[PDB]
């Protein structure tokens with residue numbers, strides 16, 4: 017978007033739809049595969065041509081300046097940083113131009129004014145999401161040890177106006193989190209209690225997003241309170257077997273757990289997300305050749321009865337000798353031909369199973385055992401494998417089982433003081449000669465700085481006020 | 489204020505009126521502008537000649553020994569400390585002299601004895617107020633981090649006798665709060681249930697004052713119980729628009745929310761309080777040139793429909809370019825000439841909107857959601873902008889909107905674990921080139937010692953038993 021304030025409701029709504037079209041390609045599963053692969057869950061395969069290995073084996077020399085953000089490619093660490101700043105920039109343009117349009121009294125009636133204020137609240141949630149996704153990967157956790165002098169308590173460059181080419185320093189962690197949380201807070205007051213559409217920002221998604229941020233911050237009482245606002249509003253998938261689970265889970269339209277998602281059809285909004293499964297169409301069947309596969313400990317986390325053991329992960333590597341992360345396989349509603357797989361999925365922004373997990377973790381931390389027991393037993397049972405002992409260990413295992421492929425594990429390891437024990441893990445025995453037994457290039461102990469990414473090299477070169485994260 | 493006991497009821501009543509005359513110049517809005525400006529709500533303007541900047545930009549070197557308390561000036565931190573210690577001293581003389589008169593049986597009948605005991609109870613409320621106003625600015629909050637060794641659990645010098653030149657150590661926090669609360673408790677038992685006059689200490693003001701102290705201490709159950717005693721006794725201003733709100737609000741005589749205030753007329757009791765609005769008379773016009781203005785986030789707390797957006801703050805900076813705090817503009821009843829502004833206000837000691845806010849916060853803390861919802865919706869609606877979602881964030885916003893200019897925010901930031909994020913805040917865009925973009929001279933994170941003031945330098949030099957607050 018641009019710098020000219022809006023002159024009509026139609027113009028405002030068109031730019032609002034423009035912002036959701038951008039969100040679909042930003043808050044996308046393809047942007048979270050990098051943080052996913054950097055966790056302690058995967059090993060590379062012989063199919064990997066040093067593409068996923070820098071994240072998997074913690075190759076610090078490559079990760080330092082990883083990715084691209086130019087006219088020909090937007091990928092990796094540099095691509096992630098670019099798309100979330102571009103999302104923040106366009107949400108700024110939308111928010112400021114709607115605020116100006118409201119101040120200039122350009123709307124025709126009270127309905128246009130009320131709806132424009134509501135759109136403005138949706139924009140604020142997207143400003144909070146963009147700045148938080150930058151905080152999540154480019155600001156350090158409190159537990160970090162050695163860091164570049166002055167970076168420990170720094171956030172990100174906090175820019176509130178559509179201003180490309182801006183040269184400024186990083187704001188503090190407190191300043192960035194105060195802005196994220198004030199945005200969500202101001203939005204929750206305007207957005208109606210009941211969700212208008214699964215395709216648009218709602219008060220339900222604002223509570224879910226804030227619950228996620230509070231959990232990440234270790235604010236368990238506040239995470240539990242936000243989680244309780246939406247946890248009972250979305251029912252879990254009701255499935256008698258794995259086949260019924262797959263057909264509902266893989267359906268954007270029919271899955272009752274989705275709170276917010278991006279528009280998708282066979283012609284618009286659909287995209288392949290084959291990084292983790294290395295899947296390709298082969299007539300009416302699907303060929304698999306992954307570049308990274310989970311370790312045996314990840315496979316053994318699931319009971320054979322668990323519906324996610326043939327959906328989230330699938331024994332499809334080399335026909336049937338190993339397991340592959342098949343969460344983003346397809347939504348058959350986005351096929352061009354009914355019987356021909358094209359492996360197209362839609363962008364999902366929040367689902368109730370993540371809210372259940374935020375609630376269980378936060379309840380265990382605040383000593384609310386009945387709440388932890390109710391929601392952990394409910395989620396695991398619906399998945400076909402009920403947990404028998406509800407404790408922090410069972411939450412850690414069920415959270416890992418549920419959010420595999422979604423880039424949660426790297427964050428979870430840091431919050432749970434889990435070092436990367438990659439070198440000690442047993443690879444899948446049926447994948448001998450395919451799965452790599454490559455050791456970490458750099459060890460990742462509790463508090464290691466490289467759990468946080470370095471700011472892209474171009475940005476560090478053009479902005480002398482930007483303080484880098486990594487020492488040495 | 490002598491050491492000689494009273495010999496008659498007339499003498500007792502004359503000294504009681506002398507104490508209220510002193511209170512007017514002590515518990516005055518001019519003494520609370522310093523703690524107001526030290527909060528996260530203002531930036532300085534180019535009109536500031538380093539007068540308000542030491543508080544706004546946390547210039548510790550100046551704040552350390554700030555103000556004056558001599559025959560020519562009583563101002564700043566040293567002036568605040570002086571005035572409340574003088575109020576405590578004269579309240580002591582009054583209390584001790586009335587107790588002696590009752591013991592010496594100098595009164596004519598049982599009515600004189602009963603009225604003198606009631607006056608004695610009013611004096612006790614004023615001793616509690618003087619010592620609490622000293623605790624509020626010179627004793628540390630429980631959350632404080634590094635301090636001068638031995639200062640963390642100290643109160644203030646607790647002197648109960650009219651004794652000038654007294655050299656003594658600071659009492660503990662427990663000793664000072666036990667004295668504050670025992671004085672209020674003993675007064676509440678004597679003062680009649682129904683207020684005799686808005687101009688004199690009542691049981692209503694003693695409950696409001698104790699509710700304020702309990703909230704400051706985090707004693708939410710006790711604050712809520714004390715607030716419920718008075719919150720329904722004073723109706724809120726009923727106004728159809730901002731003009732009607734302004735005419736009732738600015739009227740000491742006609743505002744139904746005032747529980748206690750000092751006598752004021754054009755010739756006695758009136759005073760200008762132009763620090764925050766930089767207002768000056770110019771014939772029939774009012775010229776504004778403020779030295780500090782709120783940040784844009786403060787202006788944004790208010791909906792355009794909110795009556796406080798043109799009374800508490802008003803868009804009168806550079807004719808109509810920006811907002812200043814206009815709460816203490818004037819009471820037109822204190823004008824010398826009907827059509828000529830002289831900007832004189834009266835000293836207000838408690839209003840029911842503060843009692844509503846104490847109740848809402850305390851209810852949110854004790855899980856009494858119906859009470860929080862009832863009183864937060866009632867106050868915000870009467871102000872022309874009803875809150876739709878009642879939560880902690882709504883209370884913090886509502887309290888900040890309502891108590892702006894009254895020196896509540898510094899205290900509130902500390903109780904709510906809010907650090908000073910001044911450096912990240914956007915200044916009012918129409919005030920570019922007027923509003924200063926100056927960063928804090930010292931950061932103020934959660935628990936920083938400088939949230940509490942240092943004891944005046946002259947007192948630290950003449951009293952070797954006085955332990956200072958600030959480290960380094």
Ligand SMILES: O=C(CO)[C@@H](O)[C@@H](O)[C@H](O)COP(=O)(O)O
Nearest residue numbers: 505508509512687688749750751
């Ligand atoms: O303030 C009050 C009541 O709050 C009055 O009891 C007191 O101020 C008298 O007006 C004293 O009169 P003077 O000595 O001439 O100032």
Ligand SMILES: O=P(O)(O)OC[C@@H]1C[C@@H](O)[C@H](O)O1
Nearest residue numbers: 194195198199528785906913
């Ligand atoms: O998000 P902003 O910049 O408007 O900051 C508003 C916040 C809310 C308040 O608690 C803090 O002082 O600042």
Ligand SMILES: OC[C@H]1O[C@@H](O)[C@H](O)C[C@@H]1O
Nearest residue numbers: 202787788789790791792
């Ligand atoms: O004037 C509109 C404003 O309303 C307030 O209640 C919010 O804090 C921010 C918003 O910009």
